[PDB]
Design a protein around this ligand. Structure first.
Ligand SMILES: [Ca+2]
Ligand SMILES: [Ca+2]
Length: 314
DNA sequence: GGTAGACCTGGACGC
DNA sequence: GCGTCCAGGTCTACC
């Protein structure tokens, strides 16, 4: 059937593969784990979302990542298009190599890694990432996903409709900086997060020099970027870290939330040295991050992603 | 320079 | 049925 969301079984001719063993990627451990909030499993084992300003559905077999795009006559994805997918999942970095290293220097990680393979990091767009995580604070993944959806529906470009689901592209700075955006987001249920989105959009545009400012941060240092991001309304060290790690190519940035905070205590018997605070404080959180960085190396952020993901289930 | 509440929302959760 | 607790925290007003 030419309608609704596709499935590998339903329309074989429209799918193309990317060699990728499950040990290098587990869609179900990555897509709904709080990295990106734009993917839904519309059909069992099939994930649909907007990627590179187009709609896709992904599914995998033992050794293959099957992809299908919705753009003209319906046809399988092209090599170039497939490359978009590869870049998005940063498939050039070998998860096996990282897992080996982390596992060799951390027994606990080895134990977790034995049951949660294929958890890698997505390379996300700076804008989409920055605003998605501004919506993530003092909130749960289920709700956050809804908020980002209505945000895109209300201020993003309409892409294509599958069944009764209409996909939108992520809003632009100009749209987010638009008049009365906050009031609207409020009526959309983003709570006090509403003002953050408007204020941060207006600030990057009317004070930091626009989109270029954000993108330039990808070349800047982690210390650099993190400091820069913390300027924006609604962006603290934790949100700043999420953005550095997932969108600004800072693989050593380690987001420290409640999850990573309980993980450090329960799994590593970790306690603040540079402080005596009772809960995650700006100083203790800073210290935990260094701890993890010192324990896992240059890709500590990625190691964190595996544990955060695993903790969402366990 | 460490440190207590105050938020929007809405699934649990225990009562 | 229903107040509490809490989730990928940030912001800010006393110490
Ligand atoms: Ca909390
Ligand atoms: Ca800030």
């Amino acid at each position: 059937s030419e309608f609704g969301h596709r499935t590998l079984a339903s329309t074989p001719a429209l799918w193309a593969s990317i060699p990728c063993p499950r040990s290098e990627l587990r869609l179900d451990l990555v897509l709904p784990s709080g990295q990106s909030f734009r993917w839904r499993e519309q059909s069992p084992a099939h994930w649909s979302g907007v990627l590179a300003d187009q709609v896709w559905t992904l599914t995998q077999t033992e050794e293959q990542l099957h992809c299908t795009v919705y753009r003209s006559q319906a046809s399988r994805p092209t090599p170039d298009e497939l490359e978009a997918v590869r870049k998005y999942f940063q498939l050039d970095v070998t998860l096996a190599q990282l897992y080996h290293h982390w596992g060799s220097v951390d027994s606990h990680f080895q134990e977790v890694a034995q049951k949660f393979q294929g958890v890698r990091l997505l390379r996300q767009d700076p804008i989409e990432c920055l605003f998605s995580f501004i919506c993530s604070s003092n909130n749960n993944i289920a709700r956050i996903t809804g908020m980002v959806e209505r945000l895109c529906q209300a201020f993003g470009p309409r892409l294509i409709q599958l069944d009764d689901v209409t996909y939108h592209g992520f809003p632009s700075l100009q749209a987010l900086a638009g008049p009365e955006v906050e009031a609207h987001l409020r009526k959309l249920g983003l709570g006090y997060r509403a003002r953050y989105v408007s204020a941060s959009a207006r600030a990057i545009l009317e004070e930091q020099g626009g989109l270029a400012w954000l993108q330039q941060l990808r070349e800047s240092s982690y210390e650099e970027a993190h400091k820069a991001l913390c300027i924006l309304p609604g962006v603290g060290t934790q949100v700043a870290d999420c953005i550095c790690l997932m969108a600004l190519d800072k693989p050593q940035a380690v987001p420290v939330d409640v999850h990573m905070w309980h993980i450090a205590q329960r799994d590593y018997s970790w306690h603040p040295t540079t402080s005596q605070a009772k809960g995650p404080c700006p100083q203790t959180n800073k210290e935990l991050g260094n701890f993890f960085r010192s324990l896992w190396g240059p890709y500590a952020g990625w190691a964190q992603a595996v544990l955060f993901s695993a903790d969402l289930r366990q």
